[PDB]
Amino acid sequence: ADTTYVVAGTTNLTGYEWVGTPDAAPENVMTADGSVFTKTFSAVPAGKNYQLKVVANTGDEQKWIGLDGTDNNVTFDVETACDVTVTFDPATNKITVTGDGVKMVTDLEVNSITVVGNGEDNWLNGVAWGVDAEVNHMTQVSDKVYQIKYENIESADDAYQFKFAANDDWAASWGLPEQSATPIGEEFDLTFNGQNMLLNTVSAGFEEDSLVDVTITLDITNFDYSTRSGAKATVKVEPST
Ligand SMILES: OC[C@H]1O[C@H](O[C@H]2[C@H](O)[C@@H](O)[C@@H](O[C@H]3[C@H](O)[C@@H](O)[C@@H](O)O[C@@H]3CO)O[C@@H]2CO)[C@H](O)[C@@H](O)[C@@H]1O
Numbered sequence: 001a002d003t004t005y006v007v008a009g010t011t012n013l014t015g016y017e018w019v020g021t022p023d024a025a026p027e028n029v030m031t032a033d034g035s036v037f038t039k040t041f042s043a044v045p046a047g048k049n050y051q052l053k054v055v056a057n058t059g060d061e062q063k064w065i066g067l068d069g070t071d072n073n074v075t076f077d078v079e080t081a082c083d084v085t086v087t088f089d090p091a092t093n094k095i096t097v098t099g100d101g102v103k104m105v106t107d108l109e110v111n112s113i114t115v116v117g118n119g120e121d122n123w124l125n126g127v128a129w130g131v132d133a134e135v136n137h138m139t140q141v142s143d144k145v146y147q148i149k150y151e152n153i154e155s156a157d158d159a160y161q162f163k164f165a166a167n168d169d170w171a172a173s174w175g176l177p178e179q180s181a182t183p184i185g186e187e188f189d190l191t192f193n194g195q196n197m198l199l200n201t202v203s204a205g206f207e208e209d210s211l212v213d214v215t216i217t218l219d220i221t222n223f224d225y226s227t228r229s230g231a232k233a234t235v236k237v238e239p240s241t
Contacts, residue, residue, distance in 0.1 A: 001058045001230045003056050003057065004022045004029055005029070005030040005037045005054055005056055005088055005090075006054070006055045006057060007039045007041075007052050007053075007086050007203065008020040008053050009050065009051050009053065009054060009073075010033075010049075010050055010170075012050065012053065013050040013084070014051060015027060015028075016028070020064065020070040021057065021060055023057075027208040030075060030088055033057055035089070036088060037088045037090070038087050040067070040083050040085045040086075041085075041086075042083055044081065044082060044083070044099070045078065045081050046079060046080055046081055046101065047055060048076070049075060050075070050076050050151075051074065051075050051076070051170075052073065052086065052097075053073060053095075054095055056090075062072055063088055065095065066111075066197045067095065068094070069093060071193070072228060073193060074097060075104070075105040076103060076104050077103045078099070078101045079102075080100065082101035083195045084097060084098055084101075085097070099108065107116065108189075108226050109145070110166045110226045112138075112167055113137070113139050113218055114137055114138075115136045115163075115216060116130065116163050116164065117129065117161050117162030117196070118159075118160070119133075122138060122152050123153055123159075123160055124148055124150065124162065130168055131165045131168060131169055132168035132169070136148065138216070138218060139162075143223040144219065144220045145208060145217065145218070145219050145220075146217070146220075147216065147218075148215075149196075149214065150213070150216075150217050151213045151240060151241075152211045152213075153201070153208060153211065153213070153214055153238050153240075154202065155206040155208055155210045156201060157201070157202040158198065159199075160199035161199075162216075163175045163194070163196055164190070164218055164231075171198050172192070173194070174190035174192060174193055175189050175190070175194030175196055176190070176191055176194050176197050176239040177191050177195065178195055179195040179196045180195075180197075180233045181198045181200040181224075181231075182199055184201075184235055184236075185235075185237070187232050188235070189230075190232060191232070197235075199235065199237075201214075204237055206239070210240075212237050212239060214237050215234075216233065216235055217234045218232075218235075219234075
C-alpha cells in the first residue's frame with residue numbers, strides 16, 4: 001500500500017490552510033530521503049506560531065501525525081527568514097523542524113482569549129470566525145479566569161458554534177473532543193485544539209425563540225501546557241432580563 005506524506009499547516013508556512021492531500025498541496029509532499037522523508041520551505045519569514053502536522057495518505061485513508069507521539073500541532077517560531085526543513089520518520093513517527101532561525105514553542109503565556117464562532121446579530125456580536133475580534137475578547141476577572149456575556153440570544157439548537165482562542169490566533173485553542181453540545185450550568189474540561197462547541201439552548205430547556213442571556217467563563221488556573229490538560233469552562237444560560 002503506497003503511502004504519500006504531506007506537510008499540512010498554517011497558510012503562512014505552507015501556502016494552504018491545513019491541506020493534507022497530495023493532489024491538493026503537491027508542493028508540500030515530502031521527498032524520500034534515506035529511510036525518512038524531508039520537505040524544505042524556502043525563505044520562511046520571521047514569524048510566531050507556525051504550525052504543522054504530517055499527513056500519511058494511503059489511497060483515500062489519511063492519518064494526521066502531531067508532535068513527539070501526541071496529537072498536538074508541531075509549533076515553532078522563525079527568528080530570521082530562513083529555509084525550514086521538516087523531517088518525518090515512519091519507523092518512530094518523529095517529526096523534526098530544523099533551520100538556523102527555528103525555535104520550538106515549549107510554553108504558552110495567555111495575554112487574551114477570544115470567543116470565536118458563527119456570529120450573527122447579538123450572538124458573538126455578529127463576528128463570523130474572527131479569531132482576533134476585540135469585541136469578543138473575554139474580560140480577565142481574576143488571575144487566569146476570563147468571562148464574557150451575550151444578552152438577548154434567540155433560543156435555538158444547531159445554530160450556535162464557538163471555541164476559545166488565545167492571543168488572537170489559532171495556535172492555542174480549546175473546544176471539545178468531538179463537535180457536540182456544551183454542558184450547560186456546570187464546569188467541564190476543555191480539549192486543546194478541540195472541535196467546535198455547540199450551544200443548544202432548546203435541548204437545555206429554553207423554549208425555541210425565547211430570549212436567553214449567556215455567560216461564558218474560562219478557567220485556565222490548572223491548565224498545564226506540557227500535558228495540554230486542565231482548562232475548564234462554564235456556560236451559564238438564563239431567561240433574558
Ligand atoms: O476559519 C473558519 C474555521 O475556524 C475554526 O477552525 C480552526 C480550528 O478551530 C483550529 O483548531 C485550527 O484547526 C486546525 C488544527 O489546529 C490542525 O491540527 C488540523 O486538524 O487542521 C485544523 C484545520 O482543519 O485552525 C482552524 C482554522 O483554519 C473552526 O473550528 C471551523 O469550524 C471554522 O470553519
